[PDB]
C-alpha cells in the first residue's frame with residue numbers, strides 16, 4: 773500500500789506526463805520495441821515500422837500511445853482503488869491480446885526510463901520509487917484478474 777505522500781509524487785509526475793501525452797507515448801513504445809523486440813510482434817499493425825523515425829511518424833502508433841497512457845493515468849488517479857477500470861484492461865489483455873505479465877514489466881521499465889529522461893528534476897529517488905510502487909501494485913492486481921479469467925500471468 774502506498775503512502776499519501778507517495779501517491780502525491782506519482783500524481784505530481786503524471787501531471788507533467790499529461791502536458792504531452794502523445795510524445796511520452798511514442799517514446800515509451802519506441803523504447804519498449806527496441807529494448808525487447810518480441811513485444812512489437814503482439815502488434816500486427818506496427819510490426820513493419822522499421823525505424824525510430826518511422827515509428828514517430830506513424831499516427832496509428834501515436835494514437836495508440838495516448839490510448840494506453842490515458843488508461844494508465846485513470847488507474848493511477850484512483851490511488852489503488854482501481855477495480856472498475858482495471859477489469860476491462862485485464863479481460864482484453866488476458867483473453868484477447870494475451871500479454872504476459874512480463875511484457876507489463878517491460879513497459880513499466882520503459883515508462884520509468886522515459887519519465888526520468890524527460891523530467892529529472894521532478895523524478896528523483898523518492899518519485900521513482902513511488903511510481904515504481906504504483907506500477908508494481910497495478911501489475912499485481914492485474915495478474916490476479918488474469919487468473920480469475922483463466923491463463924496464468
Ligand code: HEM
Pocket residue numbers: 811812814815816839840841843844860861864865869871875876879
Ligand atoms: C501500462 C500497460 C498497458 C496499458 C494501460 C495498455 C492499454 C491498452 C488499451 C487501453 C488498449 C485498447 C483497448 C484494449 O485493451 O483492447 C490496448 C490495446 C492493446 N494492447 Fe495494451 N496496454 C498495456 C500494455 C500492453 C503491452 C505491454 C502490450 C504488448 C505488445 C500491449 C498490447 C496491446 C494490444 C495488442 C492491443 C490491441 C491493439 C490493436 O490491435 O488495436 N499492451 N492496450
